[PDB]
Amino acid sequence: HDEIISELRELCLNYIEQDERLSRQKLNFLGQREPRMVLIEGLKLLSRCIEIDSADKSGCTHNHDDKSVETILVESGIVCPGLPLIIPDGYKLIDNSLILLECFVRSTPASFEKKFIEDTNKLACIREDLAVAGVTLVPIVDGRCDYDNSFMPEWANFKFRDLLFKLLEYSNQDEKVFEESEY
Amino acid sequence: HDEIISELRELCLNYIEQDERLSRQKLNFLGQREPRMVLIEGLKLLSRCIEIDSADKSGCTHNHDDKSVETILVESGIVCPGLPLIIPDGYKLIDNSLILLECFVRSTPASFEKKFIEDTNKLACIREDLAVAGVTLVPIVDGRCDYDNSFMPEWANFKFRDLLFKLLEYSNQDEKVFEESEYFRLCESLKTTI
Ligand SMILES: O=C(O)C(=O)CC(=O)c1ccccc1
Ligand SMILES: [Cl-]
Ligand SMILES: [Cl-]
Ligand SMILES: [Mg+2]
Ligand SMILES: [Mg+2]
Ligand SMILES: [Mg+2]
Ligand code: NA
Numbered sequence: 130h131d132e133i134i135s136e137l138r139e140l141c142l143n144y145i146e147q148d149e150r151l152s153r154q155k156l157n158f159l160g161q162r163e164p165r166m167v168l169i170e171g172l173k174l175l176s177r178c179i180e181i182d183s184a185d186k187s188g189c190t191h192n193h194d195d196k197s198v199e200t201i202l203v204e205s206g207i208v209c210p211g212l213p214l215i216i217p218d219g220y221k222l223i224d225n226s227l228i229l230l231e232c233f234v235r236s237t238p239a240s241f242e243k244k245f246i247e248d249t250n251k252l253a254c255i256r257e258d259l260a261v262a263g264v265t266l267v268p269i270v271d272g273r274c275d276y277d278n279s280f281m282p283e284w285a286n287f288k289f290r291d292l293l294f295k296l297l298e299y300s301n302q303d304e305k306v307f308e309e310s311e312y
Numbered sequence: 313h314d315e316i317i318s319e320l321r322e323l324c325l326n327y328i329e330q331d332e333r334l335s336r337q338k339l340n341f342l343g344q345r346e347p348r349m350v351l352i353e354g355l356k357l358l359s360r361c362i363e364i365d366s367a368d369k370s371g372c373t374h375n376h377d378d379k380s381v382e383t384i385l386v387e388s389g390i391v392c393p394g395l396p397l398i399i400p401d402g403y404k405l406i407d408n409s410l411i412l413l414e415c416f417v418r419s420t421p422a423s424f425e426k427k428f429i430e431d432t433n434k435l436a437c438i439r440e441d442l443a444v445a446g447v448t449l450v451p452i453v454d455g456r457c458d459y460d461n462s463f464m465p466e467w468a469n470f471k472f473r474d475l476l477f478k479l480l481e482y483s484n485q486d487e488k489v490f491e492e493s494e495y496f497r498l499c500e501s502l503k504t505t506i
């Protein structure tokens with residue numbers, strides 16, 4: 130556990146590119162001491178790498194601060210009340226067009242298509258609200274089939290995931306030592 | 313000394329506020345291994361906390377990327393060629409007025425007043441160059457007498473500085489040991505290529 134956490138921190142500091150948009154989540158990760166919290170912030174760190182790559186590939190701004198669509202519009206001088214709470218992975222306002230980006234990773238075709246339709250529906254549900262406010266929605270769903278990203282060599286991506294999986298294994302191995310113990 | 317470095321890192325992670333403007337320098341600091349580089353980046357981290365604190369209390373933008381005044385103007389579409397190279401600690405363009413901020417810490421009254429005059433002159437020397445380009449300079453010099461800032465509790469600021477000083481003492485001993493080493497003689501002798 131201590132060794133796994135140490136190896137994870139070393140990968141984070143030495144083998145994830147120092148793009149400044151990642152620095153906050155790296156610090157969030159490096160600050161964690163509890164295994165369950167290392168795992169949680171490590172998955173989030175991997176996710177941000179994917180999100181920022183998707184934003185750069187899709188031509189918009191990564192939603193670094195988890196702003197809502199409401200805030201993004203207000204931020205740009207656009208009133209649109211009653212908009213449900215939607216926090217996109219990326220966004221870009223060009224003229225009257227609001228690009229909204231959702232991205233994800235899934236590892237089987239069934240889970241891929243399910244999440245693809247979920248994120249599509251999530252953005253689609255504010256199209257008409259945006260249209261009433263003069264904003265044409267440009268919704269983008271970028272589904273990935275693995276965790277490959279431009280900020281990490283493939284071998285270090287793999288080692289990071291292998292190490293996170295060991296923390297998962299220990300948790301699950303922990304409670305089967307709970308389940309054959311208990312009541 | 314490994315323990316001192318570890319303590320500085322814990323203070324950085326646990327007691328320096330998670331302001332997004334500090335992310336880069338905090339990460340730069342946490343990645344250092346060599347005692348002297350830990351010391352330099354730790355001092356730079358503390359300086360960054362004060363500079364950003366000053367920008368916030370003076371109502372302007374911290375100069376996150378060390379942009380020059382010329383660069384700040386060309387980003388807002390203002391031409392102005394001349395300009396000496398000047399990197400303010402903070403800036404804000406409002407209407408036709410360019411706020412420029414310099415901040416510093418000094419620990420004696422004589423050094424405080426000397427530095428205040430220096431920074432005041434540094435900014436004043438471009439007032440007319442800006443006025444020709446249509447810009448009213450609003451120059452601010454924020455001189456501080458201690459290291460307090462809003463991103464660190466007072467006790468942690470004190471203990472961070474205490475541990476940096478102990479790390480200074482340790483790296484001074486590393487240097488003296490190094491100057492007794494063959495590596496040092498080999499560095500001297502590499503004077504085969506002046
Ligand atoms: O990025 C997104 O679009 C999400 O849907 C949230 C997300 O990625 C996430 C990642 C890690 C933990 C919890 C949510
Ligand atoms: Cl639809
Ligand atoms: Cl100085
Ligand atoms: Mg998201
Ligand atoms: Mg400065
Ligand atoms: Mg200064
Ligand atoms: Na609605």
Ligand code: NA
Pocket residue numbers: 224225
């Ligand atoms: Na238009």
